[PDB]
Design a protein around this ligand. Structure first.
Ligand SMILES: NC(=O)c1ccc[n+]([C@@H]2O[C@H](COP(=O)([O-])OP(=O)(O)OC[C@H]3O[C@@H](n4cnc5c(N)ncnc54)[C@H](OP(=O)(O)O)[C@@H]3O)[C@@H](O)[C@H]2O)c1
Ligand SMILES: NC(=O)c1ccc[n+]([C@@H]2O[C@H](COP(=O)([O-])OP(=O)(O)OC[C@H]3O[C@@H](n4cnc5c(N)ncnc54)[C@H](OP(=O)(O)O)[C@@H]3O)[C@@H](O)[C@H]2O)c1
Lengths: 288, 289
């Protein structure tokens, strides 16, 4: 039963440590700020007094903090104590930061997986939870059972240390932008006296539509073909402008809709008014 | 015999509506401003009218589906005399203000009026996955419910206010178009590092599932004014968005949408919500600087 260490006792670090304990792994925890995660110690975790003590207690060291400025500020002073252990950083950040961390790990003889948690804390430790990994495949295979205690959908995506961050940020781009639009549409409805509870059942239709659009948009963008006969971009721009101006008249922030509209109109300017929404990729890639 | 219907507008959606009326056996008359559209509807049995006046005279119910209300009212106003008596159904997507103006005009001309919206793509018209909203004259909706239900399983009359369907429509399209922008953007980000969209797509089901539950939870949070952030705080999410925005900008992508996403979230943090959940961003949307 491989001993593991969790660096970071924010919401997600605590979830990761809890899943390791539930799976029966000896678990050691550490956080910059004191007093967090009381229940983890009640569940059997050892609380380390220093970062070096923490890493020396784990054959695998899992880091989950807010950014790589934070993670590397913790890890750089203790590089010598990471020798012979597998370092796994699941902090969400840019591929450039993951690649820099990977170069530093290689310099110090530290087996390295750079990863990402793609689901909320309550899903950690369940079969459906998705986590990405990239880097040392031998280390991933050796500790696959340990890692799968965090989520059944653990997905290794390649040896390049930035690849997990590519998949992570691309998906979060979609997710956060979508969550912004969800809040915004409910805010628009509320301005006109419609509670969100009345809109929510109908949005199931747009969730189903998004599932179809995931596949079609992927094929269109990979191909560079944007067939618009059944729904053209010029029509969509007019539709978006109606939303934009309605929300503006109601005193809502419309920075997001203005961006949606501007990127779409840019693609129209580039010749894509008869193409589908997928042609907006041309406006995103070729801004004015 | 079956109720005769007229479709005004032979763009993509008008053609789909006319095709569904034909499939159900309704006599169907069609008209479009520009020539040469919808000839396959004529082959399937539709009658092409030469003018909008002739088109409406052939229908007990008149269904309009054009690009905006500037367009629809420019067609309908000159033919008010021929519309009197008939039921007018406008499913063009536009602002509630335009729908209320059109409903007032119809009422002042003794035209029974439904204002509606098509919420799904053309392939779903005539199927159980169709969703259309209607608001306005309940008596006309009830009389012609069977005709309207030939378009789609979910045919939802929402209330008397002529602008109410438009509120439901634009609120949902706000979500849909914003989400579609993010889907294109995320795939574009992946491609900048050589990752095809086909490689990202299989994993997006995880986030569609998240969004499916967020639809319900976010609705409750906003209706209640409760934004519990213990398990995912807004300050953490702002940093996450920053990383996406910088990664994308450094790869040469337009980041206007992410900048807006971040700015509304940051405004909510500035209003005291850094420990609350993403739902607290409604306060930034409502109280811009
Ligand atoms: N639902 C979720 O919560 C969720 C889901 C998927 C992914 N994630 C990812 O998980 C990561 C952690 O997020 P979280 O939700 O756990 O955030 P959180 O609850 O805000 O925790 C932030 C963590 O980072 C630490 N930290 C920040 N700056 C630091 C510094 N300069 N030095 C040392 N430690 C520092 C904090 O330590 P202190 O306690 O000392 O501040 C804490 O342990 C993020 O990358 C996030 O995107 C989270
Ligand atoms: N396509 C979809 O997936 C979809 C889904 C849901 C809702 N809708 C809604 O359906 C409505 C129609 O969209 P669509 O996809 O059919 O658009 P489209 O294919 O671009 O067709 C536009 C229609 O409007 C007409 N039009 C434009 N300006 C006009 C004017 N000044 N006078 C008269 N006619 C005018 C066009 O006639 P000409 O041929 O003479 O230009 C055509 O019939 C929009 O409100 C849209 O949001 C569409």
């Amino acid at each position: 039963l491989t001993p593991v260490t969790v660096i970071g006792l924010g919401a997600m670090g605590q979830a990761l440590a809890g899943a390791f304990l539930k799976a029966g792994h000896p678990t050691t925890i550490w956080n910059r700020s004191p007093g967090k995660g009381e229940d983890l110690v009640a569940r059997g975790a050892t609380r380390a007094a220093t970062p070096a003590e923490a890493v020396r207690a784990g054959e695998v060291v899992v880091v989950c903090v807010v950014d790589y400025e934070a993670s590397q500020s913790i890890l750089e002073p203790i590089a010598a104590d990471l020798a012979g252990r597998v370092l796994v950083n699941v902090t969400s950040d840019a591929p450039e930061r993951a690649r820099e961390a990977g170069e530093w790990a290689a310099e110090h003889d530290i087996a390295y997986l750079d990863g990402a948690v793609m689901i909320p804390t309550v899903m950690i430790g369940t079969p459906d939870a998705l986590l990405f990994y990239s880097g040392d495949k031998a280390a991933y295979d050796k500790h696959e059972g340990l890692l799968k205690s965090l989520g059944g959908q653990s997905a290794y995506v390649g040896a390049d240390h930035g690849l997990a961050a590519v998949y992570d940020l691309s998906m979060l781009d979609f997710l956060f932008t979508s969550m912004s639009g969800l809040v915004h549409g409910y805010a628009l409805a509320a301005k006109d006296g419609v509670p969100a509870a009345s809109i929510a059942p109908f949005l199931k239709s747009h969730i189903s539509l998004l599932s179809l659009a995931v596949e079609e948009t992927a094929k269109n963008l990979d191909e560079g073909a944007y067939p618009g006969a059944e729904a053209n971009l010029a029509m969509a721009v007019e539709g978006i402008e109606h939303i934009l101006h309605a929300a503006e008249r109601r005193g809502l922030d419309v920075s997001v809709l203005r961006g949606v509209r501007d990127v779409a109109q840019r693609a129209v300017d580039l010749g894509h008014g008869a193409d589908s929404w997928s042609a907006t990729v041309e406006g995103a890639r070729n801004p004015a």
